Write a protein that binds this DNA or RNA. Structure first.
Ligand SMILES: COc1c(N2C[C@@H]3CCCN[C@@H]3C2)c(F)cc2c(=O)c(C(=O)O)cn(C3CC3)c12
Ligand SMILES: [Mg+2]
Ligand SMILES: [Mg+2]
Lengths: 98, 61, 190, 49, 135, 92, 49, 61, 67
DNA sequence: AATCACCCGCACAGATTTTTTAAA
DNA sequence: TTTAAAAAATCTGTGCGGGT
DNA sequence: GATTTTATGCCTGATTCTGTTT
DNA sequence: AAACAGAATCAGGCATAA
């Protein structure tokens, strides 16, 4: 599973093999065809997940030294449009998630 | 299969024709009969046919 | 003179007449030979004409004219459409009519008009009408009382199981798939 | 491409797909698989049964 | 396809509904063109008990019948005082396929125009079946 | 396999064939009985069927089918149109 | 106004005219008078004549 | 009146078909022949038919 | 045919098939139709005829069998 | 000589209406 | 406390073969 | 079960060009 | 300098065929 964090704290879920497959010399495909992002909304961090179990938490580390902890079970089911997972301020971005 | 003269003189001449006039008697059973015989549901129609035409004819006592 | 009538009685009588006629004489097959009345009349007319499996072909118009002029009081286009279906290898498991000309294709093409084609009886169709002249079945009257038609055929083939049937009536319908002849014969022997 | 050797229909699949998936979708959405409801009714002694 | 008459008083006119084209032509040839009109029907008619209102409005046979009657339909402009003929006569064959058409027409008249039936404007014809001759 | 042919000879032969056939066998009457081939064939078929003047009537489809299937190798609608005209009191 | 007795067509004359002029105009302009060209050609010994 | 397989195998197969190819020989007689046979005037056509179908057939030696 | 018509837009180099075959019945009406088609081709498209693109088919008439 | 519209029962894919449920 | 998205639950065409 | 377009010859009524006159 | 007679062209209808 793939968890995508955008520039506004949005979270989306996806499978790895659903991504475009190409060769070494190929350019790629625009990710806008796969996620309903904004015109200037871009991913900044990806957290692979094997399966959901227990009630373990997800530690989120952003820029400017901000921390946050949330329960994983909130991300067990997601719609086409993601739900806000963190209230960011100004030009603060998630850089590390585990 | 009839010539026009025969058709006129047997059915359309007011001097020697016979007809029927349609009237309504109850107006509360007519709705039920029309709904049963001309409606979308099939099972009431099948039951009506089976009860009337099939079994009642075999025993006219 | 004018006499009154109630609407309920008229509705009931007319609809019961139509329903019973359609159920008993147009759309369902007999369990003994597996044929509808139109199939039986077509086969009987072809047998009377002398249209055998090892003789020359005859034009379809002649057969249709005989059928609708002596036995079947309906239109001719539907009779021709009925005759066409009994000769297509992708419709019947064992064909009953032998055709010469353009009779359509599995691709969806239509058959030619009846001024262009020719037909005769198939070899297996002679086993459906064996011993017909030795008083083995009953005969009934036509719509005028001038000719006579068989009531059922003295068949040697279990036609209903090996060819199937499909028809729509008032209040009921039928749908039977075709089978293989050797297996049915073995089952009958068992 | 049907000919005198028999029926033959050719369908070509892109490089960004799998043949099994499109075959299953064709089974589901077109008449490559149909249902047949059996209903055995016939006339016995002049009565439906 | 309507073959009208010459009388202008609706209380002295008749309208015939015939089953087919051949019978329609036969009736047109041998009528009294002073006060009799002919309207032929082709094929079997819609069942207005199993259909919806817009489907009934978009069918051409029913539309022509409604136009020829002249009363209007829809329970919003339906005025049974503007009927163009005071006698409606149904003429079909004497077989089992005429009974079906009679039932369909009766269903239409009873479900859509109750006042016409209540006032007694509908009739049914009785053609003969045999003919005998000895010299 | 492939054989050349001049256009003039083909045109001449084909048109003469069609014209002579139409002149001698479709559209002109014979001075002795006053009938065209189709009238003669229809009358002969009705005579063979036993369709006499003091017997019962017969369906038109039966007669048309016999004529088309034994004597006249053409379409069946024009044959019925021909038969119809021979029975109208305002035509003959 | 044709009926079983026979054919009958009625044409109404206006109040300010005589019938004869109208009748002659109808003869000259409508199909109340036609021409029939006679041309007797038949087959004799298999030849037209 | 022919079955499609018979039609193919007798007329449309390139390995069994026989055909004719159309050519023009004189190009000055063709125009006159076409004008006479397919034109509007009837008298030349009748004269041509008579000459080529009666005198050249019933009389010969 | 795909060549145009009118001698003002008629270009005989746009022909979509290089073989045109006429197939009719073996009776008199087939002969009449053949003459009409030949008239059309000769009067309206002479270059097609002059280049040998027109053919005539020849079907059989009888079939015999003994065993 | 091809094309056009209905009756009659049954099975199913696709389009509309109500009803619930997680996000601001 | 709204309020857009699932999600179920109803409707709606269509074709098979003898007839008008 | 209605309507729809061609061939083939002869006759007619309606419309469109062409030279003439007031 | 337009009218106006005379001539030429064009459709449509009739019974068997595709
Ligand atoms: C004119 O009636 C028919 C129609 N139509 C009826 C419709 C409503 C009126 C306007 N015409 C349409 C087309 C049709 F489509 C098919 C057939 C038809 O196949 C047929 C037959 O013997 O095979 C016979 N008939 C007539 C005996 C009913 C057909
Ligand atoms: Mg039909
Ligand atoms: Mg025709």
């Amino acid at each position: 599973h793939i968890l995508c964090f955008s520039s506004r704290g949005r979270v989306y879920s996806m499978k790895v093999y659903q991504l475009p497959e190409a060769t070494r010399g190929a350019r790629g495909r625009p990710i806008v065809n796969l996620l309903p992002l904004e015109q200037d909304e871009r991913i900044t961090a990806i957290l692979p997940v094997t399966e959901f179990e227990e009630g373990v938490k997800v530690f989120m580390a952003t820029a400017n030294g901000t921390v946050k902890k949330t329960v994983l079970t909130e991300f067990n089911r997601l719609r086409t449009a993601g739900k806000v997972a963190i209230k960011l301020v100004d030009g603060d971005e998630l850089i590390g998630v585990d | 299969e009839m010539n026009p003269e025969q058709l006129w003189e047997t059915t359309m001449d007011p001097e020697s024709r016979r007809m029927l006039r349609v009237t309504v008697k109850d107006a509360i059973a007519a709705d039920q009969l029309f709904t049963t015989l001309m409606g979308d549901a099939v099972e009431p129609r099948r039951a009506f046919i089976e009860e009337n035409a099939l079994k009642a004819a075999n025993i006219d006592i | 003179e004018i006499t009154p009538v109630n609407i309920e009685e008229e509705l009931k009588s007319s609809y019961l007449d139509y329903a019973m006629s359609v159920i008993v004489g147009r759309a369902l097959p007999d369990v003994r030979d597996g044929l509808k009345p139109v199939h039986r009349r077509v086969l009987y007319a072809m047998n009377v004409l002398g249209n055998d499996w090892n003789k020359a072909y005859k034009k379809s118009a002649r057969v249709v004219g005989d059928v609708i002029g002596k036995y079947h009081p309906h239109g001719d286009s539907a009779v021709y459409d009925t005759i066409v279906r009994m000769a297509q290898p992708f419709s019947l498991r064992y064909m009953l009519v032998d055709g010469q000309g353009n009779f359509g294709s599995i691709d969806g093409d239509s058959a030619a008009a009846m001024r262009y084609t020719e037909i005769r009886l198939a070899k297996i169709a002679h086993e459906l009408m064996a011993d017909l002249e030795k008083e083995t079945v009953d005969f009934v009257d036509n719509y005028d009382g001038t000719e006579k038609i068989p009531d059922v055929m003295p068949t040697k083939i279990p036609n209903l199981l090996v060819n199937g049937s499909s028809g729509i009536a008032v209040g009921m319908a039928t749908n039977i798939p075709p089978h293989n002849l050797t297996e049915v014969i073995n089952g009958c022997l068992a | 491409e049907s000919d005198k050797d028999g029926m033959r229909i050719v369908i070509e699949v892109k490089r960004d797909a799998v043949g099994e998936v499109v075959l299953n979708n064709l089974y589901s959405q077109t008449q490559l698989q149909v249902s047949f409801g059996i209903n055995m009714v016939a006339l016995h002694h002049g009565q439906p049964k | 396809k309507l073959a009208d008459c010459q009388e202008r008083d609706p209380a002295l006119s008749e309208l015939y509904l015939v089953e087919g084209d051949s019978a329609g032509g036969s009736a047109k040839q041998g009528r009294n063109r002073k006060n009799q009109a002919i309207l032929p029907l082709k094929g079997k008619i819609l069942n207005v008990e199993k259909a919806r209102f817009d489907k009934m409005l978009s069918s051409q046979e029913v539309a022509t019948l409604i136009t020829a009657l002249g009363c209007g339909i829809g329970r919003d402009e339906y005025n049974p005082d503007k009927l163009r003929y005071h006698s409606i006569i149904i003429m079909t064959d004497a077989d089992v396929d005429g009974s079906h058409i009679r039932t369909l027409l009766l269903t239409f008249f009873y479900r859509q125009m109750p006042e016409i039936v209540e006032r007694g404007h509908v009739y049914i014809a009785q053609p003969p079946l045999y003919k005998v001759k000895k010299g």
